[PDB]
Design a binder for these strands. Structure first.
Ligand SMILES: [Mg+2]
Ligand SMILES: [Mg+2]
Ligand SMILES: [Mg+2]
Ligand SMILES: [Mg+2]
Ligand SMILES: [Mg+2]
Ligand SMILES: [Mg+2]
Ligand SMILES: [Mg+2]
Ligand SMILES: [Mg+2]
Ligand SMILES: [Mg+2]
Ligand SMILES: [Mg+2]
Ligand SMILES: [Mg+2]
Ligand SMILES: [Mg+2]
Ligand SMILES: [Mg+2]
Ligand SMILES: [Mg+2]
Ligand SMILES: [Mg+2]
Ligand SMILES: [Mg+2]
Ligand SMILES: [Mg+2]
Ligand SMILES: [Mg+2]
Ligand SMILES: [Mg+2]
Ligand SMILES: [Mg+2]
Ligand SMILES: [Mg+2]
Ligand SMILES: [Mg+2]
Ligand SMILES: [Mg+2]
Ligand SMILES: [Mg+2]
Ligand SMILES: [Mg+2]
Ligand SMILES: [Mg+2]
Ligand SMILES: [Mg+2]
Ligand SMILES: [Mg+2]
Ligand SMILES: [Mg+2]
Ligand SMILES: [Mg+2]
Ligand SMILES: [Zn+2]
Ligand SMILES: [Zn+2]
Lengths: 56, 55, 53, 96, 71, 124
RNA sequence: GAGUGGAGCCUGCGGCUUAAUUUGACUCAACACGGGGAAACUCACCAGGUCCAGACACAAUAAGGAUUGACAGAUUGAGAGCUC
RNA sequence: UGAGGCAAUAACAGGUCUGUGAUGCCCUUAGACGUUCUGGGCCGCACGCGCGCUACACUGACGGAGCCAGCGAGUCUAACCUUGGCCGAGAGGUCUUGGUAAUCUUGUGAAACUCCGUCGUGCUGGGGAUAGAGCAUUGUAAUUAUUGCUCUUCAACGAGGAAUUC
C-alpha cells in the first residue's frame, strides 16, 4: 500500500474503466449493462447490473 | 489533450478535470463507538479513513 | 535460456506502453495513469475525468 | 508449441484445479504468478487447449481471460487420468 | 515494394545425425557387462549419462553443456 | 645523428610510458568525457576484442601491420594498449580499416569511419 | 497598436543528397500539425545476424529413436552451437 | 456580468487502417512485410517556403542593491519533489533532512520591475553567431558534438521591398 490521494483516486477510476470493459465483453449474451464497485471492511464488492442473472 | 486522434485540423485542445474534495473530522470517544460508527455509515465512492494517536 | 532476445527497456518511450492498446506514442503518463490520449478520451468518463470548462 | 511434459503438467494440473487462468499479454516474462513456468509456455499451451474446444479465451486491456469448459474438463480429467467426477472449481466452497 | 535480391547461398538447419548409438557397453561370454565411455559425477546426471570422447575433451551433454572433466 | 626524432606526448607522457602504463593510468590522464566513461561500467566490455586484437598483432608477419580486426563498437575510446593495430570500424555497412596512431588517443573509433556519403549538390 | 516579411540561429515543409536519409498532411481548413523535443528504444528506413511465439485437422517419418540442447574450436560485430 | 463547457438539422468522397486485440477486402507469412539483436538513418546540404527565438541599444547593457505572483507537481513494495550542513569560481559534489502533501520542497524571495553606480554613442561596454580549449551532469552508450559550466573567439544585424499575421 501507501499511495498519494490523487494517484489513488485516479487509480480507482482506471480500476473502474477496466472492469466495465472486461464485463462488457464477457457477459454480452447475458445483457450486461454496467457495474458498480462498493468498498467496505472485510470485502470488495462488485455488482453486475445485467438483464439475465440466471446466466450469470 | 488535442481532440483529434491524428494531426489534421485546427489544433483543438480539450481539457479534462476530476474533482478531489478532502475533509477531515476529529473525535474523542471509546473503542465501542468508533467501531460502531465506522463499520456502518458505509458509502460507496467516498473514502473513509480513521487513524488514531497524537503523532 | 536464450541469452539473445533483449536489450535495455528501462526508460524512454520503449519501456512503457498504454494499458489498453500497446501504443508507445502519445502517452498520458501524469497521475500514473498511463493511457494513450486516444484511449484516454475513450475512457475519460469511466475514470472520472469530465468536462466542466 | 515446444515445452517439456513437466511444464505441460504444471499448466494442466494448475488449470484443472483453478478452472480459470490469467496471463498478461507479455511474452519475455519467464515465469508468471502462480505457475512456475515460462509466460510464453502458458499463453501458447492455453491457446492450444482453446482452439480444440476445451477452454475459451478473452482478452481486454492486455490480459487474456482463460475459462475452462465442460468438454475441456473431460480432457484433463483424461490427461491427469483422475477418476470420473474428480474436481474443478465446481464445488461451492464451505458455505461461502 | 522491391522484392528479392540475394548474393545466393541459403542457410541450412541441423540434422541430429543418425546412429544406432548405444552399442557402447560390452558384454563378455555370458553375461558380464562392462560399460564404455565414462559417466558424469554431477548430482543431476545420475551416472546414467555419459561423456563425449573428443580431444582433451570429455564432455557431459545431459548437463546441456555443463562442466569439464578431462582424463 | 643521435636523436632518433622523439616520441609523441599525450598530455605530458611520451610514447613508451603510455605503452606499459596501463589503461586505468591512461584514462586517469585523459579528459572530461573519458574519465567518466572509464569510471562507469567495469564488468566485461572490450573483452575478447583485446584478446583478438593482440593475437593478431602477435600472429603478425613481422615488420607489417596486423590483420584487421572488425568490430561494431563505434563507441570505444582509443587507449595506448591498442596503438598500432588495424580496426574495422563499421559505419552502417562494411568495416572501414583504420590504423591507430599515437595521436588518435582518447578519440572514439566512430570519428574515424564516416556514416554518410558527403553531399555533392547540383552536379550531374 | 505590437509585429512578421530584411539579419543570426531554432524549428517544421519543399528540393537536392543518400545504403537509408521511414511516413501522413498541401488554400482559409497542409508546413512548433500527427501530441512528431528520434543517441538505444521509439522505428515504420538502410547494412547485416537470430527466433516461431506457423493454433488446430489429417497424413508422413519414427521407440532399433520423431525431436531438443551444447562445452571448446572454427566461425561471427558479439560469451548466437547462426553455421561447421 | 468576464471567460469557457455543452450544442439540432444537414453536408465533405476533409483527416485518421500510423492510437486501438475496432474492421471488410487485398497483399505477405520462414531466404518474413512476423519479432528480436548489432550498427546507421530520420539531424544528412548549392538552395525555395512557414512557425519562431535573439537582436540592432541610452524608455539601454553591465554591476551592486531593493524585492513581489498565480495555475501546478511530486517516492511502494520505490528512488519522485527536495530544505538544511559543509566542499567546489561554476556547473556540480557530499553527509544528512521533511513530504503519498493546504502539513515538507514553497512565501516556489519568478521575471520583467524599482533604486545607486559604471559606460557615453563609437558595429560601443548594443549583439552573440561561429569556433578553440578545459570542467561536470543523464544514461549501457554522448563521435555527427543530449544538456550544463569556465575561458577565449566578437559574425550578421544601424528598424528591415513588395507584401502580410494578430
Ligand atoms: Mg523483449
Ligand atoms: Mg553413446
Ligand atoms: Mg557510407
Ligand atoms: Mg508595419
Ligand atoms: Mg512508412
Ligand atoms: Mg476557416
Ligand atoms: Mg534497431
Ligand atoms: Mg534465440
Ligand atoms: Mg504448417
Ligand atoms: Mg455565468
Ligand atoms: Mg480524399
Ligand atoms: Mg485510426
Ligand atoms: Mg490492416
Ligand atoms: Mg497512439
Ligand atoms: Mg474502440
Ligand atoms: Mg509490414
Ligand atoms: Mg522529423
Ligand atoms: Mg512550405
Ligand atoms: Mg500553426
Ligand atoms: Mg539591472
Ligand atoms: Mg502559492
Ligand atoms: Mg577546483
Ligand atoms: Mg523518509
Ligand atoms: Mg554599429
Ligand atoms: Mg562590440
Ligand atoms: Mg553582452
Ligand atoms: Mg553522438
Ligand atoms: Mg547524421
Ligand atoms: Mg535527445
Ligand atoms: Mg520594427
Ligand atoms: Zn491507447
Ligand atoms: Zn553432467
Amino acid at each position: 500500500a501507501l499511495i498519494s490521494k490523487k494517484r489513488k483516486l485516479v487509480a480507482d477510476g482506471v480500476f473502474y474503466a477496466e472492469l466495465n470493459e472486461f464485463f462488457t465483453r464477457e457477459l454480452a449474451e447475458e445483457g450486461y449493462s454496467g457495474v458498480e464497485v462498493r468498498v467496505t471492511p472485510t470485502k470488495t464488492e462488485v455488482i453486475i447490473r445485467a438483464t439475465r442473472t440466471q446466466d450469470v | 489533450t488535442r481532440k483529434t486522434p491524428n494531426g489534421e485540423g485546427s489544433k483543438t485542445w480539450e481539457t479534462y478535470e476530476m474533482r478531489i474534495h478532502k475533509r477531515y473530522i476529529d473525535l474523542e470517544a471509546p473503542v465501542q463507538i468508533v467501531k460502531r460508527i465506522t463499520q456502518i455509515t458505509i458509502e460507496p465512492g467516498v473514502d473513509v479513513e480513521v487513524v488514531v494517536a497524537s503523532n | 535460456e536464450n541469452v539473445w532476445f533483449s536489450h535495455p527497456r528501462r526508460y524512454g518511450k520503449g519501456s512503457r506502453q498504454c494499458r489498453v492498446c500497446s501504443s508507445h506514442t502519445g502517452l498520458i503518463r501524469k497521475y500514473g495513469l498511463n493511457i494513450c490520449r486516444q484511449c484516454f478520451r475513450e475512457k475519460a468518463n469511466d475514470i472520472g475525468f469530465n468536462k466542466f470548462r | 508449441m515446444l515445452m517439456p511434459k513437466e511444464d505441460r503438467n504444471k499448466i494442466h494440473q494448475y488449470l484443472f484445479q483453478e478452472g480459470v487462468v490469467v496471463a498478461k499479454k507479455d511474452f519475455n516474462q519467464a515465469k508468471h504468478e502462480e505457475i512456475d513456468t515460462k509466460n510464453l509456455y502458458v499463453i501458447k499451451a492455453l491457446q492450444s487447449l482453446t482452439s480444440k474446444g476445451y477452454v475459451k479465451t478473452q482478452f481486454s486491456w492486455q490480459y487474456y481471460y482463460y475459462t475452462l469448459t465442460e468438454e475441456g474438463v473431460e480432457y484433463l480429467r483424461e490427461y491427469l487420468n483422475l477418476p470420473e467426477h474428480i474436481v474443478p472449481g465446481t464445488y461451492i466452497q464451505e458455505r461461502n | 515494394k522491391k522484392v528479392y535480391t540475394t548474393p545466393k547461398k541459403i542457410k541450412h538447419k541441423h540434422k541430429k545425425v543418425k546412429l544406432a548409438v548405444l552399442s557402447y557397453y560390452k558384454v563378455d561370454a555370458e553375461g558380464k557387462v562392462t560399460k564404455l565411455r565414462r559417466e558424469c559425477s554431477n548430482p543431476t546426471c545420475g551416472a546414467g549419462v555419459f561423456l563425449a570422447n573428443h580431444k582433451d575433451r570429455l564432455y557431459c551433454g545431459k548437463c546441456h553443456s555443463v562442466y569439464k572433466v578431462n582424463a | 645523428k643521435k636523436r632518433v626524432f622523439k616520441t609523441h606526448s599525450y598530455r605530458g607522457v611520451d610514447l613508451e610510458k603510455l605503452l606499459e602504463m596501463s589503461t586505468e593510468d591512461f584514462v586517469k590522464l585523459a579528459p572530461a568525457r573519458v574519465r567518466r566513461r572509464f569510471a562507469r561500467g567495469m564488468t566485461s566490455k572490450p573483452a575478447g576484442f583485446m584478446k583478438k586484437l593482440r593475437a593478431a598483432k602477435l600472429a603478425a608477419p613481422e615488420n607489417e601491420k596486423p590483420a584487421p580486426v572488425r568490430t561494431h563498437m563505434r563507441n570505444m575510446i582509443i587507449v595506448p594498449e591498442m596503438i598500432g593495430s588495424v580496426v574495422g570500424i563499421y559505419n552502417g555497412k562494411a568495416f572501414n580499416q583504420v590504423e591507430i596512431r599515437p595521436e588518435m588517443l582518447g578519440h572514439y573509433l566512430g570519428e574515424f569511419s564516416i556514416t554518410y556519403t558527403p553531399v555533392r549538390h547540383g552536379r550531374a
